[PDB]
């Protein structure tokens, strides 16, 4: 099973509720530390699949497979050994693995995911090795409102705060981005001495991020003097 | 870019052969574009 989509969408939540509702052991690792060093290049994949087999039936879930099954895996022999070990453990064929293809110990589902689906090799996404592909995307306005409510439940909100009139300003935001936005509003709430967080704190946070986006870091006083520095007619043209 | 070292012998040229080379390629490319985009 190949999961794909933008990062930070909660791809681990799908696997975790998979394990919870299915009631199985859940072998979980990360693909970054599999090209670790010379002490064990491809042996980690083999011991991973052996632990999975010894506790089979179960799931196998690996993070950032693009660091292993990337298009530059055939160049580096160290990458090639790991990719060959993974693609050999992906199938049966008793030789070189020493186990019957059809057995309880071979009832293992291999979950893999990345952030770049087109970066993977042509022979890894082939049917028989990777069958189903799930594409998880960014949420929409109502889910954004619910996430804003969820991540800001344990904070002292005012009465005028309403995220339904700022949904158009948060297009493409992930859950981590909304959490960062709430923390940002809290920080500029406590910076100005404010006890609560109104809507204007969120508006100011979004506006200051937008101002910083083009590389303008100015406090109020310097912004005011630089506005006063410009003449009147050449501001009158920008006004029209 | 006019061969800043002066030639002591008249046999040597006043300009390096590679001075005006990008303009030759530019003119050739423009003429070839005009020739190909007309037929």
């Amino acid at each position: 099973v190949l999961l794909s989509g933008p990062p930070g969408t909660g791809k681990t939540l799908f696997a975790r509720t998979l394990a919870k509702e299915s009631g199985l052991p859940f072998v979980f690792a990360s693909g970054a530390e599999f090209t670790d060093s010379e002490k064990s290049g491809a042996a980690k994949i083999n011991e991973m699949f052996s632990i999975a087999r010894r506790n089979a039936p179960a799931f196998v879930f690996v993070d950032e497979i693009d660091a292993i099954a990337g298009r530059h895996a055939r160049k580096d022999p160290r990458r090639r050994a790991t990719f060959e070990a993974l693609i050999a453990q992906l199938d049966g064929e008793k030789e070189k693995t020493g186990i019957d293809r059809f057995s309880l110990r071979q009832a293992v589902i291999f979950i893999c995911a990345t952030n770049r689906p087109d970066e993977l090799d042509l022979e890894f996404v082939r049917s028989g090795r990777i069958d189903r592909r799930l594409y998880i995307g960014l949420p929409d306005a109502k889910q954004r409102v619910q996430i804003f409510g969820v991540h800001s439940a344990g904070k002292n909100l005012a009465e005028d705060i309403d995220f339904g009139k700022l949904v158009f300003r948060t297009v493409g935001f992930s859950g981590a981005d909304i959490r960062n936005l709430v923390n940002e509003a809290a920080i500029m709430s406590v910076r100005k001495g404010r006890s609560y967080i109104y809507q204007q704190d969120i508006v100011d946070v979004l506006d200051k991020q937008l101002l910083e986006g083009m590389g303008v870091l100015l406090t109020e006083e310097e912004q005011q003097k630089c506005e006063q520095s410009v003449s009147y007619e050449k501001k009158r043209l920008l006004a029209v | 870019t006019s061969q800043t070292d002066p030639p002591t012998s008249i046999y040597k040229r006043w300009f390096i052969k590679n001075t005006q080379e990008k303009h030759f390629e530019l003119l050739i490319q423009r003429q070839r574009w005009l020739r190909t985009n007309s037929s």
Partner: protein, 498 residues
């Protein structure tokens, strides 16, 4: 590092030949080597390094060995390829060891054969390269730190100056740069005299003709000439080197060995014979009538040798006439180039073949060279064009090296802008080639009897000589009927005995 410490190297300045300018320049080094005191009293800074640059087989190593032998100093020989290793730092250690062993017995000579192996230029077009750079750094440190008062002269022999780093060419490391030119006619003569004293020689061998007729041949190539002559005489069980065996070695090393019975059909040989005989007849006619500044035919053959199914041999003239190539000389040489197609067009009527295509390409390129590169005609042209095809100057086939070479522009090319004069240049070249083709076909068609008789005689004998071609030309005057040849009992019969 078994640097051979020989008290007598076995060769002196009498063993070198054809290197007169370089040995005359190195006589100063020999004078410094035998007694440096008069050098030291007046205050000379002797050359830190002398670089011998030249073609292989010219005996630069022999020159340095002769210098050491005449100077009576130990000679340290260890090639550049002996400084390359896999481990790092060993080559610099060998450099230091060789240098300090040289400083032990002062005066002494250090010689590095193929110095460009360690001194490859960092071209911008494993750990061995780092070893090369470290060895270069150690060598330049030892050279720059060499005080000139102790008289240790370091010699560097190289085959290519372009790949050698300019840091060594800086004064203070390689002060002297000597070129070792290939031996001249007198030089090859003297090398033949030296090498002929080792093998038994007959009085019928005239080495002057062999020295004159083998241009640019190195001393090692003359050595292999005399060695293969000895082996041919062994094969023939000859008691001494005859002139026939020497010429056999010549044709073995120049064009190649003769095959056994490998011949194509009777049509595959008539066309090549017609082409080569037509080229020879045009050359001889241009020599006879208009007194051209062109070469002379030696012999014409259709016997396959090496990878040439047929061959015509042309002598090489003196290089003093190879500098100011005038327009008439180029036009007659260009007529000689189309002589082959003239022969196919007159003998076969209108069915030519592919055997004369290369001469056509050469004529077409030299017409452009006359027009664009040299600008010999007098409409002025703004640019020259490089040759799309490049064929190297080579053996017995037409010389094509009258101006050093044919297919070498002297960096006289520029990219064109106007495309309307390019067609006028093409039309001018076509007009020149067509007019010249009609003139060469008209001159060759006037003598069909001599051409046909030479073709028949060469086909019967499989080889003809220049004197035989001249005899056929004299005995067959222009405007005689072909029936006179056709009534003979044997058209391919040569009554002339050389």
């Amino acid at each position: 590092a078994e640097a051979r410490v020989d008290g007598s190297t076995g060769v002196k300045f009498a063993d070198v030949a054809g290197i007169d300018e370089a040995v005359d320049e190195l006589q100063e080094l020999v004078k410094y080597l035998k007694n440096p005191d008069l050098f030291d009293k007046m205050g000379i800074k002797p050359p830190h390094g002398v670089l011998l640059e030249g073609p292989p087989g010219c005996g630069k190593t022999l020159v340095a060995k002769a210098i050491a032998g005449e100077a009576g100093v130990p000679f340290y020989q260890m090639a550049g390829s002996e400084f390359v290793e896999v481990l790092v730092g060993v080559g610099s250690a060998r450099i230091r060891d060789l240098f300090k062993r040289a400083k032990v017995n002062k005066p002494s000579v250090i010689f590095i054969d193929e110095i460009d192996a360690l001194a490859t230029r960092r071209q911008g077009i494993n750990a061995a390269t780092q070893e090369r750079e470290t060895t270069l750094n150690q060598l330049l440190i030892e050279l720059d730190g060499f005080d000139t008062g102790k008289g240790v002269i370091f010699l560097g022999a190289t085959n290519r100056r372009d790949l050698l780093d300019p840091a060594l060419l800086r004064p203070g490391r390689f002060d002297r740069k000597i070129r070792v030119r290939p031996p001249n006619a007198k030089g090859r003569l003297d090398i033949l005299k030296i090498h002929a004293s080792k093998v038994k020689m007959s009085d019928s061998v005239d080495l002057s003709s062999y020295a004159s007729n083998l241009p640019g041949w190195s001393g090692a190539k003359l050595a292999q000439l005399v060695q293969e002559a000895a082996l041919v005489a062994v094969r023939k069980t000859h008691n001494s080197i005859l002139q026939s065996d020497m010429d056999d070695a010549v044709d073995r090393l120049t064009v190649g060995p003769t095959r056994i019975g490998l011949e194509l059909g009777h049509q595959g040989q008539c066309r090549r014979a017609t082409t080569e005989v037509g080229v020879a007849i045009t050359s001889h006619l241009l020599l006879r009538y208009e007194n051209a500044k062109i070469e002379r035919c030696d012999r014409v053959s259709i016997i396959p040798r090496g990878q040439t199914l047929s061959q015509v041999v042309f002598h090489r003239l003196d290089d003093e006439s190879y500098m100011f190539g005038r327009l008439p000389q180029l036009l007659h040489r260009l007529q000689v180039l189309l002589g082959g197609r003239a022969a196919e067009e007159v003998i076969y009527g209108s069915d030519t073949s592919k055997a004369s295509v290369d001469y056509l390409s050469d004529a077409s390129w030299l017409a452009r060279k006359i027009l664009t590169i040299w600008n010999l005609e007098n409409p002025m042209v703004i640019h020259g064009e490089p040759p799309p095809w490049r064929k190297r100057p080579q053996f017995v086939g037409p010389r094509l090296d009258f101006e050093g070479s044919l297919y070498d522009d002297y960096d006289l090319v520029e990219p064109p802008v106007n495309f309307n004069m390019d067609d006028e240049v093409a039309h001018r070249s076509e007009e020149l080639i067509s007019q010249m083709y009609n003139k060469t076909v008209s001159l060759l068609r006037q003598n069909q009897t001599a051409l046909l008789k030479t073709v028949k005689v060469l086909l019967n004998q499989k080889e003809i000589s220049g004197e035989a071609i001249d005899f056929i030309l004299d005995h067959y005057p222009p405007q005689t009927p072909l029936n006179s040849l056709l009534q003979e009992q044997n058209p391919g019969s040569l009554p002339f005995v050389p």
